[PDB]
Each structure stands twice: as C-alpha cells, then as structure tokens.
CSV table of C-alpha atoms in Angstrom, one decimal:
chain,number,residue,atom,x,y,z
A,31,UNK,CA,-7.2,-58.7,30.3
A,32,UNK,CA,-10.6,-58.6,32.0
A,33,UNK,CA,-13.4,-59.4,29.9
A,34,UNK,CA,-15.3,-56.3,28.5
A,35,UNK,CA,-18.2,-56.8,31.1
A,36,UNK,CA,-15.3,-57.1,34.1
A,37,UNK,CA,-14.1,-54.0,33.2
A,38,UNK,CA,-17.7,-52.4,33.2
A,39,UNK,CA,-18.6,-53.8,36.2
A,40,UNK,CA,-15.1,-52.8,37.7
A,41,UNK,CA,-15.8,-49.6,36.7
A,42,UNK,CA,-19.5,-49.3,38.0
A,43,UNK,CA,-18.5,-49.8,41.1
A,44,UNK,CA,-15.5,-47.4,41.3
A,45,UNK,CA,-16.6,-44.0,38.7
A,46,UNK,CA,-18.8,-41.3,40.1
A,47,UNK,CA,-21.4,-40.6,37.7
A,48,UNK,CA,-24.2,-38.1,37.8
A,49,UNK,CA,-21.6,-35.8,38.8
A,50,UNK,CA,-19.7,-32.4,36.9
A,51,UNK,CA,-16.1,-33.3,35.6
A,52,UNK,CA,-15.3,-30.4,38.8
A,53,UNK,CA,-17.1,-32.4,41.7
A,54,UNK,CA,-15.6,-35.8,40.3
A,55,UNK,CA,-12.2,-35.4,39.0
A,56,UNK,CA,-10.5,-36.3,42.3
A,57,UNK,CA,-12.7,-39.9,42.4
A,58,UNK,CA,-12.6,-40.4,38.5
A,59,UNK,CA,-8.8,-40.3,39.2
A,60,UNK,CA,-8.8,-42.9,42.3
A,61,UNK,CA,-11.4,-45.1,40.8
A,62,UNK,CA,-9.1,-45.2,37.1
A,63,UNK,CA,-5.9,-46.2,39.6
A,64,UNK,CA,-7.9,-49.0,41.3
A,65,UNK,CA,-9.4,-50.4,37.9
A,66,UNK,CA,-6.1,-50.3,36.7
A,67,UNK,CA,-4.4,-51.8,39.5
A,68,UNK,CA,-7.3,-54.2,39.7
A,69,UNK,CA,-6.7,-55.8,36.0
A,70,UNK,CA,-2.5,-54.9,35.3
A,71,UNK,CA,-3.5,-52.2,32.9
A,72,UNK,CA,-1.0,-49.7,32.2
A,73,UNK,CA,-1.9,-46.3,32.6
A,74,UNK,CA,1.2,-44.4,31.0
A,75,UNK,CA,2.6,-45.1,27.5
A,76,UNK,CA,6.2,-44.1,26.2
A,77,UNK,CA,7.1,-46.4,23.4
A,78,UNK,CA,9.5,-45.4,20.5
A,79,UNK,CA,7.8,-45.5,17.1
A,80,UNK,CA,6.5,-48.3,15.7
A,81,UNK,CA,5.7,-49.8,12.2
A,82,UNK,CA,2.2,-47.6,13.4
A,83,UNK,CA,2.3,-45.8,16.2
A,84,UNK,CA,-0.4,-43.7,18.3
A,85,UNK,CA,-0.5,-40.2,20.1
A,86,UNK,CA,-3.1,-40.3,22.2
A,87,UNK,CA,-4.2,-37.5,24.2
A,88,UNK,CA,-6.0,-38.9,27.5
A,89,UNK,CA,-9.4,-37.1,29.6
A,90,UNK,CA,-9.6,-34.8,32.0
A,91,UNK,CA,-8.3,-36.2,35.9
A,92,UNK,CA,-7.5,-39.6,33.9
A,93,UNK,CA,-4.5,-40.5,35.1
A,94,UNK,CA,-1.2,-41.2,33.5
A,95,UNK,CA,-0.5,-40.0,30.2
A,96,UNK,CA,-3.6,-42.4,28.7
A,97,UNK,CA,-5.9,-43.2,31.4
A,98,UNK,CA,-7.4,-46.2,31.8
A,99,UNK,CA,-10.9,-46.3,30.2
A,100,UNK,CA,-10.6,-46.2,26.8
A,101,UNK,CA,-6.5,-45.7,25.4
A,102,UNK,CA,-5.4,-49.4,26.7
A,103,UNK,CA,-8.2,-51.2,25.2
A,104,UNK,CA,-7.9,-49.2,21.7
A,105,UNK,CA,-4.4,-49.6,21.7
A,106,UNK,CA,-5.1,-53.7,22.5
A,107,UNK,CA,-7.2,-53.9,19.8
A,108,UNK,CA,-5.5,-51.9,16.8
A,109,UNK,CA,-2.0,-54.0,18.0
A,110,UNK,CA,-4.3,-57.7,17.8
A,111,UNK,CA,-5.8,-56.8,14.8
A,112,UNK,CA,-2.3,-55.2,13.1
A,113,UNK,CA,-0.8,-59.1,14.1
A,114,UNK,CA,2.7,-58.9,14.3
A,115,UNK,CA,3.2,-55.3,12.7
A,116,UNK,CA,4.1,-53.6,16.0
A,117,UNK,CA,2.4,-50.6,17.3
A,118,UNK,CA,4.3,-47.7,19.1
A,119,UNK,CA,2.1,-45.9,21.7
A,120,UNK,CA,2.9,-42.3,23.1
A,121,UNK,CA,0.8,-40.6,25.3
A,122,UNK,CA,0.3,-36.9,25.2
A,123,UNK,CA,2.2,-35.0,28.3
A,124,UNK,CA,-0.6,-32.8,29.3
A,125,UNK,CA,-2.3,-31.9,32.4
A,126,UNK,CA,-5.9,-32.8,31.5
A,127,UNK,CA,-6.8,-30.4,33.6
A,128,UNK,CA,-10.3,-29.0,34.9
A,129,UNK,CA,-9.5,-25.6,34.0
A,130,UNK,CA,-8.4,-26.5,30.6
A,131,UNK,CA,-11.1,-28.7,29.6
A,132,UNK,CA,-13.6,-25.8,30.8
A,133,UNK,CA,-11.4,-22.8,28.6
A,134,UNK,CA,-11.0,-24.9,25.3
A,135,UNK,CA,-7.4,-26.6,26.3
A,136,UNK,CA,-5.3,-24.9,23.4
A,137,UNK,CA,-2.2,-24.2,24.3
A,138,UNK,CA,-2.4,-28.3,25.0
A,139,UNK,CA,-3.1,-28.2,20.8
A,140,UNK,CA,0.1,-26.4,20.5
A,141,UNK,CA,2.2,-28.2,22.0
A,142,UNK,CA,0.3,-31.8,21.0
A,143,UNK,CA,1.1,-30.1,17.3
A,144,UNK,CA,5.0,-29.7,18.5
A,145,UNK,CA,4.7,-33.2,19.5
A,146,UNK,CA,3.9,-34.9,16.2
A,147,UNK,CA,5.6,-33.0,13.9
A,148,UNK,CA,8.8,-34.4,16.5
A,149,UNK,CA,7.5,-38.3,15.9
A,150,UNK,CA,7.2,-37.4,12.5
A,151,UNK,CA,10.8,-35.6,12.3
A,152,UNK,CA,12.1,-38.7,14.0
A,153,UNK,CA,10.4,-41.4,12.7
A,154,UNK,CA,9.0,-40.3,9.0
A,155,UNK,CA,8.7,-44.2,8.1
A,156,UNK,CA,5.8,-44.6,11.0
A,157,UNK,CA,2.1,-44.5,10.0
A,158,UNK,CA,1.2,-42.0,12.2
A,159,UNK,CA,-2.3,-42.3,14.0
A,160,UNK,CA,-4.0,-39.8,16.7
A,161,UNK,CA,-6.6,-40.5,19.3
A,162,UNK,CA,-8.3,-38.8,21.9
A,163,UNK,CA,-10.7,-39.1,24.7
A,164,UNK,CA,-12.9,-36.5,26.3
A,165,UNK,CA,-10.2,-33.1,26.9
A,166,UNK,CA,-7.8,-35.4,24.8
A,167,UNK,CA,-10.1,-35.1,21.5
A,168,UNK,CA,-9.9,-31.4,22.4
A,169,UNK,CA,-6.1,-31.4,22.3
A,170,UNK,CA,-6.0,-33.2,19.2
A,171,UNK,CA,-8.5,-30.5,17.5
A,172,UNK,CA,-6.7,-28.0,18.4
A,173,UNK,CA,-3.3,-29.6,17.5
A,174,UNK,CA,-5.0,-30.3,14.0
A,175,UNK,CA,-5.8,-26.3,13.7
A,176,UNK,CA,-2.3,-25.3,14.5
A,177,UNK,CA,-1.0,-27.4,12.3
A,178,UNK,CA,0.3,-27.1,8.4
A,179,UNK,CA,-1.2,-29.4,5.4
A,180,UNK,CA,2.3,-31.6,5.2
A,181,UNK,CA,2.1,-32.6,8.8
A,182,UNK,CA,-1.4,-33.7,8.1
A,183,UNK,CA,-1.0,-35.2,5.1
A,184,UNK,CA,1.7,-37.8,7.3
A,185,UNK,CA,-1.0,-38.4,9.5
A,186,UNK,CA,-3.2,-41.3,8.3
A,187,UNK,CA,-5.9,-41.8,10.9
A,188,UNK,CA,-7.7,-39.8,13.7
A,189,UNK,CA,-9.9,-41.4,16.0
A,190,UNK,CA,-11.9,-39.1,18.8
A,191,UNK,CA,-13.8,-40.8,21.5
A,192,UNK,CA,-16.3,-38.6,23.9
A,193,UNK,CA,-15.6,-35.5,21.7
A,194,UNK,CA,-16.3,-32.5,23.5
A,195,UNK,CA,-16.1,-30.4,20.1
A,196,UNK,CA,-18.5,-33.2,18.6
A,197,UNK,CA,-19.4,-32.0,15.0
A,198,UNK,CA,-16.8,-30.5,14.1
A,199,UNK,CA,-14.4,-31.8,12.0
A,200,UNK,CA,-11.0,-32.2,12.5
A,201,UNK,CA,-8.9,-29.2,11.0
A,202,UNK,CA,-6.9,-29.8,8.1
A,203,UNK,CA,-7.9,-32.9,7.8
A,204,UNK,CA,-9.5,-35.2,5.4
A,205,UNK,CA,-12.9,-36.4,7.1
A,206,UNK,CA,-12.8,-39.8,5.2
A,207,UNK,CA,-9.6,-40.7,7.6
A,208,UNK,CA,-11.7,-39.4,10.7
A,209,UNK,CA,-13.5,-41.4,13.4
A,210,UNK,CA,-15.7,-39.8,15.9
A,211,UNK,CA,-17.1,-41.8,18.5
A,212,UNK,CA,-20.1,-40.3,20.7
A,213,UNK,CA,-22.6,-42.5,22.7
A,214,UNK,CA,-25.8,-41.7,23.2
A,215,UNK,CA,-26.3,-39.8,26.5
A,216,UNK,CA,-23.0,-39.0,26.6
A,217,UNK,CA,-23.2,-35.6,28.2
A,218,UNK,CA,-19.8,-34.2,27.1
A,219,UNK,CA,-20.5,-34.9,23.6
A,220,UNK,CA,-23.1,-32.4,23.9
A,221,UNK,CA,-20.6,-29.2,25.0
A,222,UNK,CA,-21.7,-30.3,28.9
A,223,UNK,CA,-19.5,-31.2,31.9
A,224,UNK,CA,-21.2,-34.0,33.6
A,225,UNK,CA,-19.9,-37.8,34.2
A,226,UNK,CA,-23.0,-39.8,32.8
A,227,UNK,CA,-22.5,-43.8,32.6
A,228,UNK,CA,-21.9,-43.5,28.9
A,229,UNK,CA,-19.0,-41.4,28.8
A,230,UNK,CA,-17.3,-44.3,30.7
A,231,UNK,CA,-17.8,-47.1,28.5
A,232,UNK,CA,-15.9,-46.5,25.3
A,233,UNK,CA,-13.7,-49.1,26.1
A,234,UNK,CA,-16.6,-51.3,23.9
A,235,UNK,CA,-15.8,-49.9,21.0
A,236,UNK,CA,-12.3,-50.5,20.7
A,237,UNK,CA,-12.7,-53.4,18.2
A,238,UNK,CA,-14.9,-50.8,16.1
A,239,UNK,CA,-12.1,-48.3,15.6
A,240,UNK,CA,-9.0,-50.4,15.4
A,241,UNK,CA,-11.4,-51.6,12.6
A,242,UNK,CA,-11.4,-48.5,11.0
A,243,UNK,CA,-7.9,-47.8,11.4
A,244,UNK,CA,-6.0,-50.7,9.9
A,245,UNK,CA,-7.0,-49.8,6.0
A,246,UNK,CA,-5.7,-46.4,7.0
A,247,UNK,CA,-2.1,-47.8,8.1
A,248,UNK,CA,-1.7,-50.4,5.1
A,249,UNK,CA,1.6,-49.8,3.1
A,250,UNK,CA,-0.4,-52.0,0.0
C-alpha cells in the first residue's frame, strides 16, 4: 500500500477539482483507474461472506463496483484491525450514474435493499456492515427506507462517507450503530454537485471508522 500522503499526492495530481460531478465524471473516472493502477488497488470487490462482511455502495463515475478513493482503504483498515477474523467485501452493482446522483438514485435503494436481505438469506451467521461514499451513501439511505425492521435489526454497522443526504439519519435504523463522515468544505455534503479537494480525501479516515465498527461486529 502507498502511504496515506502517496495516495494524496497521487490523487492531486490525477482528480479534477473545482469542477461539477457533470464536467468531471469522465476524468474522476480515468484519474481513479490510474491511482489504482499506480498502487495495485483493487477497484471491484466480489467476495463470499465473511465472519463480517461489507456492502459497499461506491460514488458517482468511481469506477468498479467500489472505486478507489475511499472503499479499499476502509476495507484495509476494518480487515487489520478485525486480525485474523476475515472480512467479506461486496460491492454494490450500480451504475453511479450522473443522472441518478442528480434525481435521488432510488430505485439503486431498492435493489441495494434486494441485495442485503440476499447476503443475509445466504449468510445469516455474517455481521453484516454497510458503507457508502458520495451516490453510494445515497443508495444505502434509500435501501435503509425500503427496508423492514428484521433486515435492519441483522445489520450491525453503517458507515456513510461524503453523504449527499448529510443529516439525515439512516432509516430504520438505530443512530448509535451509524457513522457519518463529512469533511469540512466538502461540497456534496452540503446537497451540491461540485468536486472540491475534500471530497477526495476520505481515504484518511479509514482508521477512524474501522474504529468504530469493530465493537459493532463483536460476537462477545
């Protein structure tokens, strides 16, 4: 893995910011598939369940099925700090499309909602965690409103980076199992549509958030 400030620098040379998620999807794209060629990331996630395992829903033009910016690194950090418990990660098969991130991206929530209560049917031993970034925390909103109070009582951790809905809770959910993570400046966090620096650097608080999730996964 590159270092957290090789990754940053990486990507301050490769992301358009300043930029609406329209003008710069095409070049968010390319510049995610160069970082991650750059550094051996993976940018697409398919694993069975695990002893945990994720569903994360990635943001708009990432590519993949979790990008590159923020999934890998949370998914690095919750497996280090889980030690040899292993940790299943699934991506969300969406489009994380422009047009969907501009209407609300709901149907996405529907079938996001499909998908988990399918881990669940398949694998109701897993501790089941969902995270999002950007369109992705979106998804997983609207998957959570959709969605009945024994699927959510399964779920035991949801963890939203660059939350477009910022504020609002998670449907159906308790709060206390919720993570929201929303920099400063961060545009879309305010209900906006522009690229600013600190949407792209979420990747930082990875430690943070596998943090939080591990006393949500215990089976003590």
């Amino acid at each position: 893995w590159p270092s957290i400030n090789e990754f940053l620098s990486e990507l301050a040379k490769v992301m358009p910011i300043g930029d609406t998620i329209t003008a710069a999807c095409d070049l968010i794209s390319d510049g995610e598939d160069a970082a991650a060629s750059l550094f051996g990331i993976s940018e697409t996630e398919n694993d069975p369940c695990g002893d945990v395992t994720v569903l994360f829903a990635r943001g708009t033009c990432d590519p993949g099925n979790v990008g590159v910016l923020v999934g890998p690194w949370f998914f690095d950090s919750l497996q280090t700090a889980l030690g040899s418990r292993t940790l299943g990660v699934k991506g969300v098969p969406y489009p994380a499309s422009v047009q969907d991130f501009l209407s609300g991206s709901v149907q996405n929530g529907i079938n996001m909602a499909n998908q988990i209560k399918s881990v669940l049917q398949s694998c109701p031993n897993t501790k089941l965690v969902l995270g999002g970034y950007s369109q992705g925390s979106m998804v997983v909103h609207n998957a959570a409103s959709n969605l009945d109070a024994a699927t959510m009582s399964k779920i035991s951790a949801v963890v939203l980076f660059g939350d477009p809905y910022y504020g609002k809770p998670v449907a159906n959910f308790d709060a206390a199992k919720t993570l929201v993570v929303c920099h400063d400046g961060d545009n879309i966090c305010q209900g906006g549509d522009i690229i600013l620096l600190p949407h792209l650097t979420y990747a930082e608080d990875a430690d943070t958030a596998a943090a939080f999730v591990v006393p949500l996964v215990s089976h003590h």
